[PDB]
């Protein structure tokens with residue numbers, strides 16, 4: 147029982163313990179390819195690498211490496227590609243990955259400038275008159291429109307494979323107020339963001355997996371995916387009471403290491419899922435409650 151467990155853990159103040167027990171149970175698979183001397187500059191962080199069994203491969207011959215993982219949730223029937231914030235030298239690989247995996251949406255949960263350093267490279271154009279070209283991967287990216295809100299910006303991008311001259315629309319959902327190792331403003335804000343992503347059609351099975359990222363591609367990225375997966379499960383299982391957030395997070399960590407970086411982020415996932423459960427069990431008629439509470443404007 148989810149809500150019961152939440153109160154139980156809250157009262158005794160066991161969030162750090164619960165979280166740490168999860169870390170101590172977390173799967174462990176090799177990241178041999180990530181550690182090859184030729185991929186050192188393709189990794190943002192030394193301790194954050196994709197497992198070999200689930201890493202996304204680039205359809206390049208000389209080097210198919212990119213720090214990205216395919217989180218394949220079998221029961222929930224949803225895949226997500228979690229990846230690190232692109233480096234100055236991996237933006238072409240990033241968009242290449244987007245192209246080859248046929249993703250339709252990209253979810254950015256961090257800021258290019260967090261605290262005081264490159265927490266991510268500026269991988270999309272900021273002005274529609276100044277398209278970006280990644281000569282290494284033969285891709286062109288142009289900004290078509292932007293929809294700025296208080297805590298998130300949604301963008302329409304046109305990615306073109308210059309070899310094929312084929313064009314595609316990519317939706318970019320950027321959560322601009324989620325601090326590294328921090329939590330969203332509230333379950334409402336987060337859920338308002340999640341549902342807009344759901345509504346765009348970016349998560350549909352007719353498209354490639356949505357590409358989700360923050361700085362390392364594990365904390366905020368993990369919190370986002372855990373919530374979405376648990377909500378999916380509560381909408382599918384005979385009884386949502388059976389959805390164990392802890393077990394869900396553990397199956398996710400079989401695909402990428404370090405998902406959810408703080409006890410507070412795990413606690414927030416409980417909060418987000420419980421709140422989101424309300425608007426899945428019929429009461430969806432008042433979803434606008436989140437849009438109002440999130441402020442948005």
Ligand SMILES: NC(=O)[C@H](CCC(=O)O)NC(=O)c1ccc2cc(C(F)(F)P(=O)(O)O)ccc2c1
Pocket residue numbers: 190191192193194256325326327360361362363364365366367407
């Ligand atoms: N300089 C490094 O590469 C060290 C290495 C630490 C070690 O080797 O033990 N690791 C990091 O700097 C390092 C590791 C995980 C992070 C995780 C986050 C994050 F949780 F906020 P995320 O949501 O962006 O994944 C942000 C920054 C993060 C930095």
